[PDB]
Structure formats: C-alpha cells, structure tokens
Amino acid sequence: IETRKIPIPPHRMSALKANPLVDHCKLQVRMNIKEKRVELRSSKYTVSNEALQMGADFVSAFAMGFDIDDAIALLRLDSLYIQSFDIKDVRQTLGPDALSRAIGRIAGKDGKTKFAIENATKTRIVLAGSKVHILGAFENIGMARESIVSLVLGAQPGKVYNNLRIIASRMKERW
RNA sequence: AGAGGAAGUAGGUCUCCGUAGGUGAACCUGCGGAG
C-alpha cells in the first residue's frame, strides 16, 4: 500500500473542479484545493507502482497546465513525456529585457509561431512567462527544445521554422 | 512665303487576478498586473 500527494497551484481550480481516475486505473482519489493537495491512495485493487506513478504524472501534468485531452493522452500512452524548461536556463545575455522580448518572439501574434512549431514537430507546448512546458515523445521534445533555445538565442523565426521543418521530415522518415 | 537640285544621318499565446464599461449571477470588451 502506497500514497502520493501532489500540490496544485491555484491557476487550475475550476478545471480541476471539472471531473474518473479511479475508473481509469483503480487508484482511489481525494482532493482539496484549499490545501491545494491531491491525494492518491492505493487500495487493494491497485497492482503496480507503474500505475501509481502514472496517476501522479497525470495529475501533475494537469496541474502544470495542459488540458484534459492531452492529459488523458499522457495517461493512455506510456511513451509520452513532459519536460519543464525555465527561460532563465542557458542564456545569451545578462540583460533583463529577456522576458517580454523573448517570449514575444516565441509566441508571435495570436500564437502563430507556437502553433506552427507544435504542428510541425508534433509536440504540445504551453507557455506561461518564465516556464515553458513541452509534451510529446522525448525526441520530438528535443527538437522543440532546440528550436525554442534557438529562438531565445535570437535567430529569425522564418529560418528557425524552415530548419525545423526539414529536421521534422528527416526524423519522421524510417530509412 | 515656293516646286525642283544636290547631300548626310536613322511578432506576448494560455491561465489567473485587480479594474472600467457593456445585459445582468455568470459572460464579452479594453487596460494594469503576476505566473
């Protein structure tokens, strides 16, 4: 018997108030957004540490901000990973004009560039200021990470998109 | 002004918060902020 309790920030309170994991993978659940905690208890129906860690990874993904569609995709696919990249990681300058300028470069107007990168390398990323969150198979996450760090190092977005497209094709290929 | 003669050139997304207005619980818009 094992338990795991995860915190949520108060961003996602309503969507966590929206409703099932006990039916998904037989792991009993308690929640309280006043203490900001989610408790996952292992009853007798529970079998695997893999399933318990999977429920933990799912609830942490929904806390860190993905929607329920890609969240249950993370629940069902065992070959799907998440990664958290802070924007203060490896950095070209000591100037604190980083934040607005670089995340404007990454997003683009009406999310066009984030959307094009997502549809290109098949990942799903979310963006909240400092922290960016990438979701996908780990090699595609590597592709999106290299694209984003090139964007924050300051290459032109058209050039980055072109190079990303040809690398996306050559990795999609088998032989 | 005249018919001939001769010549040459051809780049802030998402969430949340505080606002002000809108049709009010909610919801939308705009702005200011934190992730």
Curated annotation (Swiss-Prot):
Subunit structure: Component of the small ribosomal subunit, ribosomal RNA processing complex (SSU RRP complex).
Residues included from the entire protein: 80 to 259 of 259
Function text: Required for small ribosomal subunit (SSU) synthesis. Has a role in the processing of early nucleolar and late cytoplasmic pre-RNA species.
Transmembrane segments: none
Record-annotated KH domain positions: 96-148
A GO cellular component annotation in the UniProt record: nucleolus
Organism of provenance: Chaetomium thermophilum (strain DSM 1495 / CBS 144.50 / IMI 039719)
UniProt-recorded name of the protein: Pre-rRNA-processing protein PNO1
GO terms of molecular function: RNA binding
Predominant location: cytoplasm
Compartments where located: Cytoplasm; Nucleus, Nucleolus
Protein family according to the UniProt entry: Belongs to the PNO1 family.
Presence of keyword Protein biosynthesis: no
Gene Ontology BP term (one): ribosome biogenesis
Alphabetized UniProt keyword annotations: Cytoplasm, Nucleus, Ribosome biogenesis, RNA-binding
